[PDB]
Each structure stands twice: as C-alpha cells, then as structure tokens.
Homo-oligomer: A and B are copies of this chain.
Amino acid sequence: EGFKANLSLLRRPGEKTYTQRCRLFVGNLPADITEDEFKRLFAKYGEPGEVFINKGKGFGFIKLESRALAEIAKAELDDTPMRGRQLRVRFATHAAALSVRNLSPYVSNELLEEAFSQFGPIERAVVIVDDRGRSTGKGIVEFASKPAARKAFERCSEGVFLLTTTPRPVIVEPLEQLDDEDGLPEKLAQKNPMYQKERETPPRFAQHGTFEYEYSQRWKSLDEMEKQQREQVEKNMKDAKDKLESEMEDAYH
C-alpha cells in the first residue's frame, strides 16, 4: 500500500508498531456503531490494528501504527461531532506497565529493555530522567501482555534481579497511572451537594487570631514534622543498609 508507506514515515527509529502506547480510547460513540464505521473514523491514519468496541456503553479502542499517528488522530478527532455527540478521544491506559526503581545511574533505556525482555515481549522500557538528563533511579517497563508483566513483577519480588555489577536489586511495582489531562472538572465536582457548601467561602489567606489561621499553621507544622520524620527514617535506614554491606563484606570475604 502507497498510503501505508507514506504514513510509516511517522514511526520513530527503534519504535515497535501497534503497541499499547499507540492505543486510543474513543468515547461518546453512537449506540448503532459498527466496527467498519469506527475504522472509517480512523481511515486517514493508515491501516488500523486491533479494534475493540463496547456498543452498549458507547466506547471503543483502536491501535494505530505509531505513537505519532495516534497523537495526530487524538488531536484531530477529539471533541469532534458524531451524530449529536462530541467524541472524547484519549490515549488508553497501559494494561501491562511496571514501575522499576533502585536503578543504578548507569542503566540506560536499552539495558532496561534487554534485561526485562527475558520475562516476555517488550514494547518499551524507559529510564525516568530529570531536567539535566540524569537518571532518577526510576524507570518504566511496558510489556506486550499482562502475564509477562506479572512474570517480571513476581520473579523480581521473589528473586534478586540485578542489572549491573553493583548488587542493586531492582524493585518492581505495578505502574501508578494518574490523570493530569482531564483531572477533576467542576461540572463533575458539582454533583456532590457538598461542593456548593465548601465553595461558600472563597479562596483566601487566613489571618492571625482566627480558627482557620491557628489550625492551618499548626497543620503546616505537623506536615513539616512529617517530612522531617520521613527523612529521618531514610537516614536511619541508609545507615542500616551501610552497616549490612560492611558486615556482608566481612562474612563473605
């Protein structure tokens, strides 16, 4: 296909096609929606991948070839009319992603992928970096399937998985996925009859002498104590970890 080859230019070097990162959620679909009509909606974005539709609930999923194509489709189709309803197009939440931590600063995206590839087919692996491009010691591993993610999670929790020379065991947890795009809209927050009551008092600075001020100041102080205490735990445990290493070196000569 001519069209397909033209759109294939949007795949990035080393990018795997039709991954979960290429998957779009489409909401507010008509009740009479067919799989062909849904695909016709995405016709301009090349050859479609797996399609899922929940006709009665008015939503579906579609995988496109590359992340770029899915970014274009989302931006072009979101909030467009479809028989009396504005479509809601979002990137689908990843179903098989894991958070990895305790990474050595010398673990790259490629080493992380190559390492986790033993648990099953891998879509992507990324080391989360800061503004200067330095490793945060945290990363994300996205698998093709949920069993492969469970295998990685179960084996890394049970066993000792090491990526570099330094014996730093990778700590593996399911990825906490949060929404900072739609968030908590007022039209939705309004539903609780209590939103009306809390909004009776407008945003403000509390004044010295009031209940609001004394309570809030003491709350901040408790919050500061909480951070100190958390930092102290961290320190105490850093010392315990060091004492462990020293004692381990002596015993294992």
Which one, B167, B184, B212, B244, contacts A162 given CB within 8 A? B212
A5 within 8 A of B: no
Are A108 and B226 in touch, CB under 8 angstroms? Answer: no
**Closest CB in chain B relative to A157 CB, distance in Å:** 9
Residues from chain B with a CB closer than 8 A to the CB of A249 are 211
A6 within 8 A of B: no
A31 within 8 A of B: no
A51 within 8 A of B: no
Interface residues of A in 175-230 (CB under 8 A from B): 176-186, 188-190, 192, 194-195, 197-201, 203-206, 211-220, 222-223, 225-226, 229-230
Are A185 and B108 in touch, CB under 8 angstroms? Answer: yes
**Closest CB in chain B relative to A132 CB, distance in Å:** 10
Are B13 and A79 in touch, CB under 8 angstroms? Answer: yes
Are B203 and A222 in touch, CB under 8 angstroms? Answer: no
Are B164 and A199 in touch, CB under 8 angstroms? Answer: yes
Number of copies: 2
A20 within 8 A of B: no
**Closest CB in chain B relative to A243 CB, distance in Å:** 10
Are A206 and B104 in touch, CB under 8 angstroms? Answer: no
**Chain A, 230-253, contact with B by CB distance < 8 Å: what is the 0/1 string?**
100110110011001100110110
Given contacts A133-B179, A219-B168, A240-B222, contact A111 B205 (CB under 8 A): no
Residues from chain B with a CB closer than 8 A to the CB of A180 are 126, 128, 140
Which one, B108, B164, B199, contacts A186 given CB within 8 A? B108
Are A178 and B79 in touch, CB under 8 angstroms? Answer: no
A52 within 8 A of B: no
A43 within 8 A of B: no
Which one, B102, B178, B199, contacts A111 given CB within 8 A? B199
Instruction: Please report the C-alpha to C-alpha distance between residue A218 and residue B136 in the assembled complex, in whole angstroms.
Output: 22
Instruction: Please report the C-alpha to C-alpha distance between residue A24 and residue B70 in the assembled complex, in whole angstroms.
Output: 19
Are A248 and B218 in touch, CB under 8 angstroms? Answer: yes
Closest 9 CB pairs of A and B: A115-B203, A211-B252, A160-B206, A108-B189, A165-B201, A126-B183, A127-B184, A106-B198, A164-B198
A sample of 22 inter-chain contacts (CB < 8 A) reads: A68-B76, A72-B72, A108-B183, A128-B179, A128-B180, A129-B182, A133-B188, A160-B205, A160-B217, A162-B203, A164-B199, A164-B203, A165-B197, A167-B212, A168-B216, A215-B244, A218-B244, A218-B248, A219-B244, A222-B240, A230-B234, A233-B233
